[PDB]
Ligand binder design. Structure first.
Ligand SMILES: CCCCCCCCCCCCCCCCCCCC(=O)O[C@H](COC(=O)CCCCCCCCCCCCCC)COP(=O)(O)OCCN
Ligand SMILES: CCCCCCCCCCCCCCCCCCCC(=O)O[C@H](COC(=O)CCCCCCCCCCCCCC)COP(=O)(O)OCCN
Ligand SMILES: [Cd+2]
Ligand SMILES: [Cd+2]
Ligand SMILES: [Cd+2]
Ligand SMILES: [Cd+2]
Ligand SMILES: [Cd+2]
Ligand SMILES: [Cd+2]
Lengths: 304, 304
């Protein structure tokens, strides 16, 4: 029934976007090979403390999202300027954290492994390509809807709008957990603490906005917060996947440092810059973006 | 006549946006003080070779823009997907160049001067605030128009649309020259070469697009290229202003490294992300953005 209609929608979408389908296939192959290597290494070696660090970071992110959701029981449908400012701040946090904490350490580590020069750029750019292809294929092959743009993805008029919004949230929050797990891969707390702090700080307002939007869809007051907390609960799964793919051979650490980063950057544009830069809302979004950029800069230079 | 109407428009705009007016006043005061200090130092000390480097970099940028403009005599009104891809590539180049080449060296230099920790973040964040306030006040107090969004700024129905488009180009291209001049302030070719190469590479497609748009406004075929070359000629003035403000006392070097950077980041959003992320054009813009990000990464890790 539903499977048949979804399969037909997938086939019709594949007939229209071949390049994206090939990109998704290649990226999925790369990711599954990386995860197999990580599982093999986890079976042979002993890197359990890194798993502990990753799960604790995911738990912190989940707590931040849950707190942001619980903040929505008193605000009662905040205005649009505040929403634009908060989402711009979150986008700036994500962008700056990605750039600094997932390009500079990756370049240094890759230069250590292979030799300084263009080779480190090559490996981390391969990571960026993998991440972008994965996220693009996912957001074109997943039936979601955004709050303002509309219904994005394959057509399926057999599921309620709540599930489409939840899928949008899932797409946003997978790369964050992935990035946390990637960061704690090599120990070296000097990366994981800044990255995790930035992720939690930007997931507070995002969780609040998600709770408000899910209320707007129709869930009365008590089920929006539950779904926001559920997405927060999703984040540790991304943390586990990231720590799985970052282990294995040594060169798999720089590559992941790019992959997640690329995904994060991608999601921002393709999911966050629309709905924040739409129809004369650029000023507040830009101001929030710069404020988040500065705050992440402080965190980077201070926390480690 | 025209001065009276423009003055009335400015007063009406000031009655509506007080915070932006105060921000522009503070930023202008800071910039003029920095420039006075730079002029005094130039009169007392001997930093002429840095002026030579800055003017040569501005000349290279002007040549790149002129070549991009001359490329428009054969393309003859390229499609919209190509325009979105090129502008996304340019935005990615600007963003990545800003972030890396104007935050990391600035943080290192500030930490050298004042001490590692949050103090370097404080000084470069002051720079970011100054730059953002300057650019915001300018784009709200300047009668320009963007290609698609419409007529942005104070009302003045007494000048042709060509001048409004030229003013938009001027607003885009001032921070680029400023950044070049800031980069070559302390010698140390390891920054200026990557920053200048990125600026020239992203100003080729921008010059081509400007030539096409000015043709679309109505200039037949032979005057659009002239105006694009004129904006390229503008860029060295920004280079001179940047080298002027970056000289002076030592702590004026990190601050500028933030200022220009902030301005650059600002302009991207508030001027480039709209017109590239509008009405189902996100995919090509994002792909171009990631390609430009990777190319700037290569340039950073290789050229110096
Ligand atoms: C200089 C280059 C400036 C312009 C480059 C970007 C323009 C490419 C945009 C093409 C595009 O949008 O096509 C989409 C998919 O493209 C794609 O899927 C291309 C994916 C390429 C991703 C590359 C991003 C990271 C690159 C980093 C380098 C990594 C390697 C380094 C060693 C949609 O196409 P459609 O399928 O919908 O239908 C197409 C039927 N005409
Ligand atoms: C945590 C904070 C998250 C949210 C922060 C951003 C929200 C602020 C947006 C306010 C806003 O858009 O107002 C505009 C001008 O604001 C402004 O002009 C504010 C300018 C602030 C710029 C700060 C950007 C860089 C900050 C980096 C820190 C630098 C210092 C570090 C030591 C328009 O206002 P209007 O004039 O049109 O009318 C207003 C009459 N209600
Ligand atoms: Cd989407
Ligand atoms: Cd999240
Ligand atoms: Cd986020
Ligand atoms: Cd503007
Ligand atoms: Cd330019
Ligand atoms: Cd540019």
């Amino acid at each position: 029934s539903l499977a048949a209609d979804l399969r037909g929608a997938w086939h019709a979408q594949a007939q229209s976007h071949p390049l994206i389908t090939l990109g998704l296939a290649a990226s999925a192959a790369g990711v599954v090979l990386l995860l197999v290597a990580g599982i093999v290494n986890a079976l042979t070696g002993e890197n359990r403390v890194h798993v502990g660090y990753a799960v604790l970071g995911g738990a912190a992110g989940f707590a931040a999202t849950a707190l942001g959701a619980l903040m929505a029981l008193g605000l009662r449908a905040i205005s649009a300027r505040t929403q634009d400012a908060m989402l711009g701040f979150a986008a700036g946090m994500m962008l700056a954290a990605s750039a600094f904490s997932l390009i500079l350490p990756g370049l240094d580590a890759a230069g250590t492994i292979v030799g300084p020069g263009p080779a480190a750029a090559a490996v981390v750019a391969l990571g960026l390509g993998l991440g972008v292809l994965l996220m693009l294929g996912l957001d074109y092959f997943t039936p979601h809807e955004h709050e303002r743009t509309g219904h994005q993805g394959p057509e399926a008029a057999r599921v309620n709008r709540v599930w489409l919004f939840v899928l949008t949230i899932i797409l946003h929050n997978l790369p964050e957990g992935m990035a946390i797990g990637v960061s704690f891969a090599t120990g070296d707390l000097r990366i994981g603490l800044p990255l995790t702090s930035a992720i939690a700080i930007q997931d507070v307002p995002e969780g609040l906005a998600v709770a408000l939007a899910l209320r707007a869809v129709g869930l009365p007051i008590g089920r929006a917060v539950l779904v926001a907390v559920a997405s927060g609960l999703m984040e540790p799964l991304g943390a586990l996947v990231g720590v799985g793919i970052s282990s294995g051979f040594a060169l798999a650490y720089p590559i992941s440092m790019g992959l997640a980063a690329g995904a994060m950057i991608f999601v921002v544009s393709h999911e966050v810059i629309p709905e924040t830069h739409r129809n004369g809302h650029e000023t507040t979004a830009t101001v929030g973006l710069m404020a988040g950029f500065a705050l992440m800069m402080f965190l980077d230079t201070a926390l480690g």
